[PDB]
Design a protein around this ligand. Structure first.
Ligand SMILES: [Zn+2]
Lengths: 194, 64
């Protein structure tokens, strides 16, 4: 709300390379909570997987994402992001994303948030914690899609990106883990994947 | 180089699907044997519960 600043002062692509994917199969069914499975656990394992994918995704285009090319964290001109973790900064996309990925990593390493021992329950607020992570992880996708799809197509990794993002968004949507407002930066890519 | 991201995503999609069908498979196997020997619905539900907890434990461990 302070971290997510859409810009009403802006008058309002090739992104719809969206058919390009790998073997997603029945992905809508894949993201569903299996009968008897704990939602927290299911959120946790997928959040970790998505983090890994996104961590690798950004690794491919980080050379192209610099202070010069991206002096403010954005998802196109109509959306800017300021960093804050409650434990807000106008900063560049590389700075923001470094803050973000360290932050997410610390959560996942936090055994009190993401317990790895059998028998140890999730914290009472795990859902809210998971929702902030996924909310902010979405921004890497959005930044890359808006600012660096040229470099993605250069590396011929559009299919791999779409696959990752499609799965991410199908998961997010299944459990309503991100407010439709914050998904604004990619509404039409998303509507194109459903 | 983007080769690791690429290889992982190509490998990831089929891993997702395999994990999904393996859960179903173990679920089907349990139902099959239960029905074969004709256990009480209480005993069946207990063991279904046990399978679910084991599957839960499994993905926690994969995450670890
Ligand atoms: Zn950038």
């Amino acid at each position: 709300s302070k971290t997510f600043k859409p810009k009403k002062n802006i008058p309002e692509e090739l992104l719809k390379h969206a058919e390009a994917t790998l073997g997603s199969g029945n992905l809508r069914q894949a993201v569903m909570l299996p009968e008897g499975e704990d939602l927290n656990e299911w959120i946790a394992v997928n959040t970790v997987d998505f983090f890994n994918q996104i961590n690798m995704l950004y690794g491919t285009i980080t050379e192209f994402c610099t202070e010069a090319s991206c002096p403010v964290m954005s998802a196109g001109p109509r959306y800017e992001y300021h960093w804050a973790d409650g434990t807000p900064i106008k900063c560049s996309a590389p700075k923001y994303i470094d803050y973000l990925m360290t932050w997410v990593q610390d959560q996942l390493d936090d055994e009190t948030l993401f317990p790895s021992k059998i028998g140890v329950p999730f914290p009472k607020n795990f859902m809210s914690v998971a929702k902030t992570i996924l909310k902010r992880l979405f921004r890497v996708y959005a930044h890359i899609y808006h600012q660096h799809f040229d470099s993605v197509m250069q590396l011929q990794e559009e299919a791999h990106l779409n696959t990752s993002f499609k799965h991410f968004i199908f998961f997010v949507q299944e459990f309503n883990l991100i407010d439709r407002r914050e998904l604004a930066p990619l509404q039409e890519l998303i509507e194109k994947l459903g | 180089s983007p080769q690791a991201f690429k290889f992982f995503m190509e490998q990831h999609v089929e891993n997702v699907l395999k994990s999904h069908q393996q859960r179903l498979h173990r679920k089907k196997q349990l139902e099959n044997e239960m029905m074969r020997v004709g256990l009480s619905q209480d005993a069946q539900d207990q063991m279904r519960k046990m399978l679910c907890q084991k599957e839960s434990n499994y993905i926690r461990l994969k995450r670890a």
